[PDB]
């Protein structure tokens, strides 16, 4: 396990990572020092000597330099010590272990590596400071974030080896992943949160910026497009310029709930000839979804073209946002005065319901549903009653939130946040729960020594009425804490148990592959599938299409 199938290899490097918005999706920022260490055995050839000799002269401590020079006999001339290190006339056939340079292909991975996407080839980009720098939209496949994660880099040593990385494991090649048969890299955080704003109908840009944004897109055809407006002031819309990022020949229809080729809600999406016609741009369009502008652009224009799509969209949108700004504060969690009123009482009735059930139950009037203890039915009710309460006070809060509310503002982009977050931060937090049940009687017949024995009322058993804003009460605190813990714990568990499963699966199938007769057999040769996936079709090259012959009335099938 740790010596034969898993070894400690040479030419490896590891450090902290951080995002870099001006780096291409498929690159990776390698801190100068690391590059000065990792090397690559390049043989001397008339197509290079000049560069090679020049580097050998640069020596092991100036970047585009090298270490070691290998000769016919198999001797190692160490370039940092060697009366003759400032001499050395390179000879065709020799080897010059050179530093890692720009554009080299390298295998970059984050652990745990439970994917192919966890290990991908990136074009090297030597840069200052000491953290691997990576494009944000390469974030998710490796499941990284920049709170401290470290990442490992490996350097191909053989000319073949390199080829194997640049032709099979390159980040471009991996955008549309076979597992979910959809893409596995979208657009996040700022670029996402922003792109949306930048898109709003209400969003217009003028000359000075437009000209910068355009220039900002590297592949710009330098042809300023005519303003959406030419009247009193020539103004362009957001869509207008973003569309510059989208290449030609890309088409995309959408239709969300209320769409209607006039989408009064600037809904759905309509992109023709690489020009965005209607619809705000957010997660559904640019996310890593199935229909996505990415799934389409990869399939249509090519992996690389789509690789670029990322940086472009980013460079533009990022810049635009760099100048529009965006933020959040407590303010964003405060709800309309009359609202908190409507909310607080929204709960006030939930409690009365629970209370009214309770008294009913205690009168033995309750009718126990089949298969459940009158006791079970009781609990289930209250829990339902309280959940709804939370959810409505929550909904109640979500409506106030003005389109200008930054939290809501991110939720709409789909860049962070969800009902729940709002609902808890703004209105009632909720009913705490341990082991699928509302807080237990750790003490005799009671929850804490601050309650009287036998007390199934909501407060007593873990219903945190307050919001994270208003603040919890000791009891609430403690309770919410109990659940908190239950979470952290199975958190530690759901990790190991899964880690194990991840392996048993991997060992079990390990050796199964699609042979040359389109069959699927394991080492023994024992056929497992006569045609892979039953259609001998590769998962990545697939997409959800509609079989227009199944639905519709018999009349419509005919019409």
């Amino acid at each position: 396990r740790g010596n034969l199938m898993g070894k400690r290899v040479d030419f490896s490097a590891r450090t902290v990572i951080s995002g870099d918005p001006n780096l291409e999706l498929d690159q990776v920022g390698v801190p100068k020092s690391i590059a000065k260490t990792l090397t690559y055995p390049e043989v001397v050839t008339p197509y290079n000597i000049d560069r090679l000799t020049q580097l050998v002269r640069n020596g092991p401590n100036e970047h585009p330099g090298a270490k070691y020079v290998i000769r016919d006999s198999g001797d190692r001339i160490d370039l940092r010590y060697s009366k003759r290190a400032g001499d050395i006339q390179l000879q065709y056939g020799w080897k010059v272990e050179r530093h890692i340079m720009d554009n080299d292909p390298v295998l970059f991975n984050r652990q745990p590596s439970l994917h192919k996407m966890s290990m991908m080839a990136h074009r090297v980009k030597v840069i200052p400071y000491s953290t691997f720098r990576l494009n944000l939209s390469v974030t998710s496949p490796y499941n990284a974030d920049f709170d401290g994660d470290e990442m490992n880099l490996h350097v191909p040593q053989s000319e073949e080896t390199r080829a194997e990385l640049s032709q099979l494991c390159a980040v471009p090649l991996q955008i549309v992943s076979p597992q979910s048969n959809k893409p596995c890299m979208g657009i996040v955080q700022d670029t996402l949160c922003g792109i949306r704003k930048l898109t709003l109908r209400d969003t217009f840009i003028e000359l000075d910026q437009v000209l910068n944004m355009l220039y900002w897109v590297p592949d710009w055809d330098g042809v300023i497009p005519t303003p959406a407006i030419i009247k009193p002031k020539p103004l362009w819309s957001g869509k207008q310029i973003l569309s510059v990022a989208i290449p030609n020949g890309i088409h995309l229809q959408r239709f969300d709930e209320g769409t209607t080729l006039l989408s009064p809600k600037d809904n759905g999406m309509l992109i023709i000839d690489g020009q965005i016609i209607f619809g705000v741009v957010e997660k559904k369009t640019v996310g890593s979804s199935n229909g996505g502008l990415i799934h389409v652009v990869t399939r249509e224009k090519g992996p690389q073209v789509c690789a670029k799509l990322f940086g472009n969209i980013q460079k533009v949108v990022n810049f635009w946002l760099l100048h529009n700004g965006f933020s959040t504060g407590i303010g964003d969690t405060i709800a309309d005065g009359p609202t908190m009123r409507e909310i607080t009482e929204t709960i006030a009735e939930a409690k009365k319901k629970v209370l009214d059930v309770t008294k009913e139950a205690q009168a033995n009037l309750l009718t126990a549903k089949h298969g459940m203890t009158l006791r079970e039915s009781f609990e289930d009710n209250v829990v339902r009653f309280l959940n709804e309460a939370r959810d409505k006070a929550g909904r109640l809060a979500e409506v106030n939130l003005k389109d200008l509310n930054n939290v809501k503002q991110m939720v709409m982009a789909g860049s962070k946040g969800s009902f729940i977050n709002i609902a808890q931060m703004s209105a009632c937090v909720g009913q705490q729960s341990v082991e699928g049940k509302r807080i237990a009687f750790g003490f005799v017949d009671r929850t804490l020594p601050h309650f009287s024995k036998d007390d199934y009322s909501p407060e007593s058993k873990g219903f945190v009425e307050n919001s994270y804003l208003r603040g919890l009460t000791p009891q609430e605190f403690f309770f919410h804490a109990m659940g908190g813990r239950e979470g952290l714990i199975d958190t530690a568990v759901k990790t190991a148990e899964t880690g194990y499963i991840q392996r048993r699966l991997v060992k079990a199938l390990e050796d199964i592959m699609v042979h040359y007769d389109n069959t699927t057999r394991n080492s023994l040769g024992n056929v497992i599938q006569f045609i892979y996936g039953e259609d001998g079709m590769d998962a990545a090259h697939i997409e959800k299409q509609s079989l227009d012959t199944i639905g519709g009335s018999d009349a419509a099938f005919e019409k």
């Binding site: 001006n22 801190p31 100068k32 020092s33 840069i127 200052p128 400071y129 000491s130 000359l207 000075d208 000209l211 910068n212 355009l214 220039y215 900002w216 710009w220 055809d221 330098g222 042809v223 300023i224």
Partner: protein
């Protein structure tokens, strides 16, 4: 340990000239002037002035990466008008206004008590 010396922010190194002028290839009468060891302060000021000249069809700029202190000014001018001239003018018009401000300030500063 991988940090670059601060002075590399304003001191040209070896083989680095304050400007490089390559002819843009996409448009006509277009030129991409790269500036070395210069940041937003200049870049944006010159971009703004360059946009006062009515014979200027385009003018934007960008610091491609914060790490490094250099930027690119792009310029496209009316047939027969050399952007380099469009650049010259701009820098001047800029200096002039500057001088002006220098004076007028110094004037006022002197009528002041304290």
């Amino acid at each position: 340990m991988n940090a670059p010396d601060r002075f590399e922010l304003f001191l040209l190194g070896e083989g680095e000239s304050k400007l490089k002028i390559d002819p843009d290839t996409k448009a006509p009468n277009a030129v991409v002037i790269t500036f070395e060891k210069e940041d937003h302060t200049l870049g944006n000021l010159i971009r703004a002035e360059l946009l006062n000249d009515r014979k200027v069809l385009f003018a934007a700029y960008k610091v491609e990466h914060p790490f490094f202190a250099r930027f690119k000014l792009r310029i496209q001018t009316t047939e027969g008008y050399d952007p380099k001239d469009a650049l010259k003018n701009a820098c001047n018009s800029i200096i002039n206004k500057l001088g002006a401000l220098k004076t007028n300030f110094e004037t006022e500063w002197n009528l002041q008590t304290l």
